[PDB]
């Protein structure tokens with residue numbers, strides 16, 4: 001009944017190597033360590049994913065090219081540079097999410113955590129949006145060995161298109177994504193009209209949101225969706241992506257959330273008493289991202305954290321106030337109340353078909 005914390009010094013060091021988020025994995029772990037939360041969790045060393053394990057979703061052609069490129073020097077472009085050691089990076093995170101999933105299967109825990117995972121843009125044969133490997137999909141595929149129905153919830157700023165498309169043709173996995181949706185904003189997909197294909201029709205849920213949304217309206221909207229989804233789909237396990245690029249102070253500067261708002265969503269999911277795999281994701285204000293996931297780690301543990309940031313390796317990065325709480329920015333909420341309701345109505349309508 002003690003939460004599992006996927007961690008090892010080698011794993012964090014590996015994750016720090018991603019140029020898009022340098023040293024972020026260390027900052028997140030160090031802050032969690034500084035709050036001594038790791039002593040209240042079961043620490044499990046992540047296995048490195050094998051070629052066969054990564055192949056459960058990704059094509060052999062892609063996996064081999066990724067390795068070849070990684071050894072010496074398919075979506076490898078601006079967002080996903082073909083840099084050396086990138087296959088080792090991909091295998092590590094994939095294996096970490098799988099390890100967490102296997103922990104859920106064994107009954108070792110009710111909640112397993114991998115903050116360095118949640119890379120949800122990767123397709124079976126294509127890297128996309130800083131994602132070389134879709135560890136979230138790999139996590140769901142592993143869970144499907146034991147659980148008959150999986151619910152995937154994506155609270156990242158960006159649409160979880162890679163996870164959605166991976167399961168868009170099946171009805172055993174339902175994907176739910178709350179994300180910014182606006183013409184020109186990555187990845188451009190995930191309108192409310194997108195519900196899946198074939199036998200997977202109505203088993204993909206998308207909630208388009210505009211800039212400036214804050215804790216209260218986000219939670220109410222998220223709860224009402226999850227409420228209908230839970231009763232309609234009746235999941236046996238949950239995969240939860242909690243990308244922190246929605247948090248105020250993120251350079252993306254889109255949503256205006258605090259970890260408290262996201263935390264309430266997490267609480268509502270945690271009370272389902274189901275096997276839950278926790279993943280990170282986006283988050284480009286490194287200190288704030290550590291703040292968020294440290295806070296959420298405390299929420300999972302049912303602990304109240306000291307407002308003042310404890311001294312640690314990255315203490316200087318937490319100026320100028322050096323506290324745990326994050327203050328929302330002073331900019332408008334661009335979401336019209338009537339639009340939110342209609343999106344909700346479409347979703348309720350689609351979930352009527354989920355009566356099987």
Ligand SMILES: O=C(CCCCCCC(=O)Nc1ccccc1)NO
Nearest residue numbers: 129130156158186243245281282283
């Ligand atoms: O958080 C993410 C990462 C998505 C990939 C990034 C979107 C494209 C983008 O914003 N690119 C960019 C921005 C600033 C400077 C250079 C590239 N996914 O959830």
Ligand SMILES: [K+]
Nearest residue numbers: 154156178179
């Ligand atoms: K999302």
Ligand SMILES: [K+]
Nearest residue numbers: 167173200203
């Ligand atoms: K689906």
Ligand SMILES: [Zn+2]
Nearest residue numbers: 156157158282
């Ligand atoms: Zn994102």
